[PDB]
Design a protein around this nucleic acid. Structure first.
Lengths: 465, 450
RNA sequence: UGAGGUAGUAGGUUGUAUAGU
DNA sequence: AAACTATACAACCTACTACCTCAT
């Protein structure tokens, strides 16, 4: 009759040296770690997007509540919750007509119209950042629905990703300028419905989620840092080894393994893994040939030395595959003797659903099942007292952790993984199931390989979400 | 001397701004005191407000709320506030707070807006800095700001029935252990006694072709009914491997390694489960890499097994709970079970479109909850058992496999207090959140559902 | 959020068309 | 120059893995 071990929720730091266990609540009470002067956003596209964004800005300046504060907390006010300048004026607006859009809509190639309209967006924003002395922190993208429907790849009247956001952010990361894409129906749900009348984008009682997500995303892309870890050991760092398989049709895919320098802050000094011409997409063994392996490890070591003034005492590798001996030896001849290496991996295909016998609330967050010293189960999604509810759907599915090789206590790495889950930044959610190294690994390995025109990625991390 | 700050708000309509402003003020170094922090249930209201106005309150703060302006106690304490303003001649004592925009200049009573009102109708940042500079103008004695005790106050007042607790709790998984494995895993070397076009899956007992041998649990004389040339095969050539060596892992020969033996055991377990529950007259659903199965409507009495709902009617389609299993030999000799629901129009044929099946699966997913999933799974497994403790797997004419009907129940050290059913409606609310978060090419099958 | 629905090897399986001594 | 019975891979069977989509 074995037992399940419980791990307490991490306390993330906040303003004036205070620690709480909720990002929404902690932002509401104290505020961010750093205070920004104020930001001046800008819209692109049509004037309809400008006016609906201005209406949403005037609405978000006012406080907006929800059905209850038990699960989704308050929004006191943008100036009251972050202390930054945000008004109706000083927003740059640009005009994009539909005559050229109407003429190029009748072209037989969807990809051609996509290329021309994306080039229009890109050269317009580069022109705006070129001849204008005014600096824009976050650019805002609003797109109409006619282009969204009549110009789809599957609609009926290869190294570039077909999704618009990925190649937008790739070609803007090549130009090192931040932007954020919102569909028109995302925030204009007041008059956005279907032919029946019911709002598909139902946001009536639940505007607090939109409020918190938009505010936190804008503040993170502003350069400010909302929260930090409470208890962390200097000398440790989190290598989230991306191994997003690249699927550019019939082009040689091989391996484009990226990594994250999640050392002490939310930013990641990411270095793009090469196209990596060793073997083919049939390289399911998923280890690392020594040359690029020690190249990536030396890049990570130099990044940690530049960002922390000292060599790291221990490095945690977070991947999604299994590891073997030769890549570990390749990592070992470039790790110093006083350092240690431990490989942790995250997978989904192993199923185990824990059920609740009595009660009306499911298995929790923070519980864990240990099989041996190297492989265990961890429950990050599910019920949580912090919202009195369950974040997951139906019965939560866990993440199966495997220490592939290396000496590490399972409890300490368990705490590391759940704090890393507690570092979700794109939206103001409580946390997510797998560590944000894996979620943001999908993000950076799906936007990073979206274009072939980039050589060296920027060190900053705000140009990714 | 007076240093206290009180919020006059309508409970429980305005716990929001009261909580936020009180915690911000207590984090700014100013002593605040109100109903939702201190005045809990069982404490008299008006006498405490009277003594705090007459002795303790420096600046009075009243939230202009819809229902908090009509109570008798608030009128009594505002009357005693006017009395104490007549006492020591302080006409700036009270502060009007504008939160409810529905209330205009005329809806507020006679004794509030006769002095100036602080602006709060646009945002709250300028509101609390205006409160701070009013504090500085009247030289109220204050403490240097520190949010540590504010965080402690939030911790002990807003996490009472709201944080985790220490008490035992019992759980159960979807893993079902194998009680007993086959004694001998026998490799049958038929040599020429196997036809070339023989499909191995057609055998009545599980078997896997391995080099020239046949990996199977069945005896040498178990395939007589379909192979008339197995009379001539002697019983001494086929090698026997004890399954205890496979499970313990101490078996390592040049013929078959230990992991290959375990994979063969898992494969034979899956084949045996498929054939044995195909024997039990359970309908089939075509899955891509697995096999989904559903219970035909009307086979079960009342559509309940031990008074547990298993198949039911919603709108026009019939929903049938079903399971799919894959053998897993890593953690223990167990069998994992997936939880599915299979939809039919009438109970005979399947849906022709898979998107309809997925939409129905989600729609019935929100309608019930994890507890109903637990009873459905338990009823399905108990119906899959003929005796009271195990399911009767078939691998040979004389050797069987036992798998326990009851799942592997676990338990945890800590648990939580259990609130009412409103938070399940909030789980439906976050289902709406998942509806309104992402969407991709939904229109065609949504308009095809009629 | 995650549960389907899709192919990739996925690691050992038995037949394509050479030269070993 | 030529007799045995293998070469010396590499194609189609199959459990562990591993992709864009649906509708909430």
């Amino acid at each position: 009759m074995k037992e399940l071990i419980y791990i307490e929720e991490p306390s993330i730091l906040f303003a004036h040296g205070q620690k709480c266990t909720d990002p929404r609540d902690g932002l509401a009470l104290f505020g961010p770690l750093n205070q920004i002067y104020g930001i001046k956003s800008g819209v692109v596209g049509t004037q309809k997007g400008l006016q609906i964004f201005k209406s949403y800005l005037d609405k978000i300046q006012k406080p907006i509540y929800n059905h209850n504060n038990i699960t989704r907390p308050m929004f006191p006010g943008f100036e009251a919750v972050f202390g930054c300048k945000w008004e109706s004026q000083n927003i740059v607006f640009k005009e994009i007509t539909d005559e050229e859009i109407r003429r190029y809509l009748f072209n037989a190639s969807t990809h051609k119209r996509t290329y021309d309209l994306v080039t229009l967006f890109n050269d317009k924003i580069i022109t705006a950042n070129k001849n204008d002395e005014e600096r824009v922190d976050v650019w805002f993208v609003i797109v109409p629905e006619e282009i969204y429907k009549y110009c789809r790849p599957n609609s009926v009247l290869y190294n570039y990703d077909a999704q618009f956001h990925d190649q937008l952010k790739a070609r803007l990361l090549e130009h090192t300028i931040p932007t954020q894409i919102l569909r028109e129906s995302t925030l204009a749900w007041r008059d956005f419905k279907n032919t029946f009348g019911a709002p598909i984008r139902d946001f009536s009682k639940i505007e607090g989620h939109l409020a918190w997500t938009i505010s936190t995303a804008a503040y993170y892309k502003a350069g400010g840092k909302p929260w930090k870890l409470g208890d962390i050991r200097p000398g440790v760092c989190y290598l989230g080894l991306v191994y997003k398989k690249i699927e550019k049709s019939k082009n040689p895919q091989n391996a484009c393994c990226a990594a994250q320098m999640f050392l002490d802050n939310g930013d990641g000094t990411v270095f793009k893994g090469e196209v990596g011409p060793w073997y083919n997409p049939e390289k399911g063994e998923y280890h690392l040939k020594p040359k690029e392996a020690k190249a990536l490890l030396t890049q990570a070591l130099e990044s940690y030395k530049e960002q922390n003034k000292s060599y790291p005492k221990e490095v945690f590798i977070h991947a999604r595959t299994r590891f073997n001996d030769e890549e570990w030896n390749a990592f070992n001849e470039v790790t110093p003797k006083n350092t240690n290496l431990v490989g942790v991996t995250i997978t989904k295909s192993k199923p185990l659903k824990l059920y609740k016998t009595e009660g009306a609330f499911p298995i929790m967050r923070g519980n864990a099942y240990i099989v041996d010293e190297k492989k265990a189960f961890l429950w990050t999604l599910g019920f949580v007292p912090k919202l009195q509810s369950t974040l997951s759907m139906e019965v939560p599915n866990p993440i199966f952790i495997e220490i592939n090789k290396g000496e590490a206590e399972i409890q300490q790495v368990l705490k590391d993984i759940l704090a890393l889950t507690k570092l979700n930044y794109n939206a103001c959610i409580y946390a997510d199931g797998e560590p944000v190294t894996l979620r943001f690994a999908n993000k950076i390995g799906e936007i990073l390989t979206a274009s072939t025109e980039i050589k060296t990625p920027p060190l900053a991390f705000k140009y990714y979400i | 001397m007076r240093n206290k700050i009180f919020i006059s708000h309508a409970t429980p309509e305005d716990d929001d701004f009261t909580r936020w402003l009180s915690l911000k003020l207590i984090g700014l170094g100013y002593e605040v005191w109100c109903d939702i922090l201190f005045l809990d249930k069982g404490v008299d209201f008006w006498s405490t407000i009277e003594k705090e106005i007459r002795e303790n309150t420096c600046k009075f703060l009243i939230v202009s709320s819809t229902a908090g302006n009509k109570r008798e106690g608030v009128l009594k304490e505002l009357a005693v506030a006017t009395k104490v303003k007549k006492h020591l001649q302080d006409d700036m004592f009270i502060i009007p707070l504008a939160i409810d925009e529905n209330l205009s200049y005329d809806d507020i009573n006679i004794e509030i807006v006769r002095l100036n009102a602080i602006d709060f109708k646009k945002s709250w940042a300028k509101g609390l800095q205006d409160l701070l500079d009013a504090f500085e103008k009247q030289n109220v004695p204050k403490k240097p700001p520190d949010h540590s005790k504010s965080n402690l106050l939030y911790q002990q007042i807003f996490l009472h029935d709201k944080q985790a607790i220490e008490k035992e709790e019992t759980y159960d998984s979807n893993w079902f252990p194998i009680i007993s494995f086959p004694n001998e895993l026998r490799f049958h070397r038929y040599d020429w006694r196997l036809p070339k076009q023989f499909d191995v899956r057609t055998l009545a007992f599980p078997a896997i072709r391995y080099k020239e041998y046949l990996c199977t649990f069945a005896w040498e004389y178990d395939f007589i009914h379909q192979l008339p040339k197995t009379e001539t095969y002697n019983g001494q050539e086929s090698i026997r491997i004890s399954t205890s060596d496979i499970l313990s892992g101490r078996y390592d020969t040049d013929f078959i390694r230990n992991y290959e033996c375990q994979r063969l055991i898992v494969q034979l377990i899956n084949k045996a489960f498929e054939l044995r529950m195909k024997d039990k007259n359970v309908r089939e659903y075509q899955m891509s890499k697995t096999f989904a199965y559903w219970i035909e409507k009307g086979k079960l009495e009342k559509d309940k097994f031990e008074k547990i709902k298993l198949v039911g009617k919603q709108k026009n389609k019939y929903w049938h709970f079903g399971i799919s299993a894959a053998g897993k030999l890593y953690p223990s000799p167990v069998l994992m079970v997936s939880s599915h629901i299979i939809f039919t129009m009438d109970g005979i044929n399947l849906i022709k479109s898979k998107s309809i099946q997925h939409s129905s699966r989600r729609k019935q997913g929100k309608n019930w909850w994890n507890d109903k999933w637990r009873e459905k799974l338990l009823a399905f497994i108990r119906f899959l058992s003929d005796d009271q403790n195990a399911i009767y797997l078939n691998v040979g004419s004389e050797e069987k496999i036992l798998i326990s009907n009851k799942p592997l129940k676990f338990f945890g050290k800590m648990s939580y207090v259990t609130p009412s059913e409103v938070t399940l409606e909030e789980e439906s609310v976050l289902a709406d959140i998942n509806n309104f978060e992402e969407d991709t090419e939904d229109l065609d099958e949504l308009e095809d559902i009629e």
